[PDB]
Symmetry: D2
Subunit: 385 residues, 4 copies
């Protein structure tokens, strides 16, 4: 289960670089030079890294410092062959963003947030990024009167439309991916789930430029089924990017390494991504627990990749097993993929076998055989057949 770059595994600079500061604790690890992270991740078999503007260039840097930080970063990519498929803006750390970025009540902050993002889009395009992610972690509220949500969605649409106008006017190929999160650090965050983000996108001026970057832990933070939400994003044609990690149910954002947390949901996610032929980066947005030293950071990163590859093998064995293929037919998954009424409405209305002469009790008595199917899946996941 050794990763190679063709597996497309990517890591944020902020993941292995996390110093371990949490709400109740100081840092447990020194800061990492982005150059060293690139080298250490390449040695593990990663394909690429991603960054926030302020991860790569310290906030407030001068032009000459900015140029030296990028030049050092570019040399580490050249030395390793690592790519930069995705980038994003930090619109959450600085105190100026305390009431939001694009939806801050203060107009001058909203304008500043847009300028900060536009500057980093240029940098991301230069480094080769195909996707620009927006995480509105500060867009939201802790109380009901502090944010008019219809007004905030107006401001959010304006911000995204202007960013779409900007990349069009430069002839950039980059697309945007919205990363939903239901809460934390705000009491409730706007566009809290995959669904809310997909619905918002359909009201933008150029919807085709925008998709979702769903994160395993963020949907599980709302108790939602992450493979189900990914399926709806695939159905809509909007899975531009994905964040992989682990999460133990409804609580603070844990960002455990992928495969920790809900192991079965991870299996069904990997099964769906491979079956659907998702071709984007397999991006890990995780935090090595602050109990770990620097050797534990890299063990945690390696674990993400390994667990993905183990699940990929087991899911593929599951789908290829003729006994599973037989069980899927017994459970009528083939019938689910058949059109309900390709004969059309009138034919359905006149079809007496659909109502007047439908034997509802005979239909009701037919078991679905889902438990035998699910136990075959569990045996395949555990390597027990």
């Amino acid at each position: 289960y050794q990763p190679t770059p063709e597996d497309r595994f990517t890591f944020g600079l902020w993941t292995v670089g996390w110093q371990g500061r949490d709400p109740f604790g100081d840092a447990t690890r020194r800061a990492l030079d982005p150059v060293e992270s690139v080298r250490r991740l390449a040695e593990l078999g990663a394909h690429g890294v991603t960054f926030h503007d302020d991860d790569l260039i310290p906030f407030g840097s001068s032009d000459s410092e900015r140029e030296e930080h990028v030049k050092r970063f570019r040399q580490a990519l050249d030395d390793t062959g690592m790519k930069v498929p995705m980038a994003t803006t930090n619109l959450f750390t600085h105190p100026v963003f305390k009431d939001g970025g694009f939806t801050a009540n203060d107009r001058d902050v909203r304008r500043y947030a847009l300028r900060k993002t536009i500057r980093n889009i240029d940098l991301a395009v230069e480094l080769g990024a195909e996707t620009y992610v927006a995480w509105g972690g500060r867009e939201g509220a802790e109380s009901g009167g502090a944010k008019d949500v219809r007004d905030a969605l107006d401001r959010m649409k304006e911000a995204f439309d202007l960013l779409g106008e900007y990349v069009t006017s430069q002839g950039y190929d980059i697309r945007f991916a919205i990363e939903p999160k239901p809460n934390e650090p705000r009491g409730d965050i706007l566009l809290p789930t995959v669904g809310h983000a997909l619905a918002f996108i359909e009201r933008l001026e150029r919807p085709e430029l925008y998709g979702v970057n769903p994160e395993v832990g963020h949907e599980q933070m709302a108790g939602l089924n992450f493979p189900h939400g990914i399926a709806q994003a695939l159905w809509a044609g909007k899975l531009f990017h994905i964040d992989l990690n682990g999460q133990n149910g409804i609580k603070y954002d844990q960002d455990l390494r992928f495969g920790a947390g809900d192991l079965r949901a991870a299996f069904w996610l990997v099964d769906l991504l491979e079956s659907a032929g998702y071709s984007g980066p397999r991006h890990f947005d995780f935090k090595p627990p602050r109990t770990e030293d620097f050797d534990g950071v890299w063990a945690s990163a390696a674990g993400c990749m390994r667990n993905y590859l183990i699940l990929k093998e087991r899911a593929a064995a599951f789908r290829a097993d003729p006994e599973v293929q037989e069980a899927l037919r017994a459970s009528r998954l083939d019938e689910l993929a058949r059109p309900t009424a390709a004969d059309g409405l009138q034919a359905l209305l006149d079809d007496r076998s659909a109502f007047e002469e439908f034997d509802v009790d005979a239909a009701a008595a037919r078991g679905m055989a889902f438990e035998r199917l699910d136990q075959l899946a569990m045996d395949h996941l555990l390597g027990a057949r």
Copy 2:
């Protein structure tokens, strides 16, 4: 705080008619004649009732029985002046729907579910309903292999498109409202939230025919902010109907009377509905607890209406208070409603006060004053100023 029919309060036959059967207990109350519910609700000041097909006509009824049930029902509406603004199909009680209705794996069940709905749409139009609600309570799964969600969404789109084709071919004015629910009775239910339903609707053949019927308890069952989700539905122009009740956080669907559960969220919901000028029915989808006798059923129904009216008065006093209007300006809610960059992208890019000369520390040091605003709201809710 006495309701009148112009307040547009509506109740499902299945709410005050609930016999008190739960997963662990037998019925604690006798069944109610729909006629008596209409009379008792009218006496309380309700505007109308809603129904499932099988609430009004017992499942399996003959044509002559069906006609007598409707004739009795119609006479109770005539005697009281009560309206029927909304109707829906029971696609969840009969064992034939155990794997779903529109997305059942068995094609013959999906066709039957469509025919059952189409039959009731006719009845609902005859009784005057403006909205037909779809609650896919059985569309979902308890295990990952039992439902391919992309296939199920294909079947769901087909079902809704055919229903839209049907009402168009009859020249009906009725529109559809999807009622989301994240789980129960299925382990996870498809279109689990307001957002997922809004996103799905945008892929239907005629999206303008479909909106959402969000329920307070269903979004709170996912830990989501119900006023926020209602705001996004209003923003999208899709709040066709609403279900009001109470719910104590993330657990089984409690269906408490409106105002119980999260009292502050109820206040902010009523504030939003009145401020936005929502003109649909104020529909209560609640269950009088099975501890109650028939007198407790009607006290519970009266409580729903009363609590709405109390919250309506307090929210209106909050918005009209000049000290609150002053606090809203101090918190820059006026600036949130102003366009971020009506001067356009180029002007924003050249505006040095948006970036090069933006004093980020002065902006960051400005408090939002949200706590004083929120305490004014709490004083208004409690009648303590």
Copy 3:
């Protein structure tokens, strides 16, 4: 992974016998004769069955009917070799228990609940049960004024003390196990968790007669760590019985087959039970989903046993692996088992290496190596080393 009776796997009559009625649906399966369940479970390798009084003898039965039901049941145990290690009272289904049994506000109901339990304790002793379980599923409330909780705990202590007085006066060996549940069917249930039940027991007249019967899904329904709670019950010497099943986080009580739901927590539970040498029944309190027919019921029951045995093998391989034993030392699990200050308080107060000369930064810089340990556990669970 074939179970045998020496594995001590037990099932409630109400589990495989569940007809599939849920809050929104009618039964999908016919009722089962308890005799047939005993035979079918024995054929699967089960050790025993458990029952509610009303599972074995239909409520309201005459003495002659009661005797024939028991005689038939006893013959099925004799024919199979199955045991009856545990029994319990149904104090939740009949409408008389709608406000509780032992803590019903109506005193005459509380007295009836006690008499109903005492009658079944006699029957359980006759059938050989070692444990009598109390599940106060109706003890609780949906609103704050309806139950004074200090008064209710007074009544609950009185009920349990009287039951302890009863079994002592008959010279019975049977002990009581309280089964906690945080909510459902009541809005909140008294003694909601393992901890609350353990604390309550310490106030009973004869605490040694009472322990806990924790259920996987019930603690996960509160977002709690079930292996952690089992550990505290073992630490207190109170794990008299256990209910095994699966549950997907915070939502209604799913009662999935064991191993479904949180697979990793199931692994750590089995590891703890085997390491601690728990010698009680491995009891499954699960519901075959109502999508299943009778063949799916037995496949689901077999899956419970199989998954336990797979996890038992993987946990044992994990603990016996010398590389894991090395990682546990690296993570200082050996030091955790050493007394903190066996030298005593004064020696600790005078030990300068505990404070004045403790190198806090050197200690802080030592990584715990938990991630490498946890990835070894994951590799062992998945069969990937």
Copy 4:
């Protein structure tokens, strides 16, 4: 609703002193001199403040600095009349505590944690504290193998027994209160709820020295009913202290001002505390949101006190209302307070009206009238009768 010191309102130095650093954001406010907090809180009507050792004396301070910090603090208490009823140890911020304090796997860290606490107990006694709080925020784990919970509970019992041995050997009157929390910053925290802490205390060498310091938000973080848990703590005689704040369901620890979050649960909490005659400090453990400036900090603190006083008035009006007293009798709250079987077990066994001649259907048909009672409570809370 103006607080006075006889209302016993207390605040942690760390509450109004919180600089606004969260997992995703830098500080939004400057640090506060503890002296200024004492003065500002006294001016608001507070009775007292509480502290962590490291709140009052910066970590690593020399003896002469330590003495000057305390002397300044003591003068602010003398100038204001403020008391210090409670103190606690910071065993969570420094990286040395990253795997816990009393239950850290490293023995030398456990010994250091004990010495750090013992030093602060001396200081707390000098300042007059009656309660010493233990919050084991780092005692726990993110993975299953990293902590043997039976071993950790052994170490926790040893730590608490040694602290009890220490205060006894000095003749101190101070008692200990354990503050439970289910998760955050650890994935799961040991003794996660009021119940688990009460059960643990009963295994300590001198149980009478230890009680609980429950926090509104911490039990709600597990979806539990906080008034119910407080009632069980009162029933056990262990409510030594309480932390008041607000929390919106199951998510990260919000620490909103008291009264925000679940308003009805706050009402029932205040009703219970006043009815039970709780005489300890009404301590607020809250964080003014980081959107606020220093004026918003004090408005937030004032709001805590005001909301408590409003709820106190409404709860008292509720209990004194003769129509409520009539409804409580109708709902048989009087019968709940009556002993179930003061006639004894034998008399119960021979009482034919408890079983043989109990009319179960007549009992079942009697409604509890809980909804009318609960609507009276809601009318009293809202000032709407």
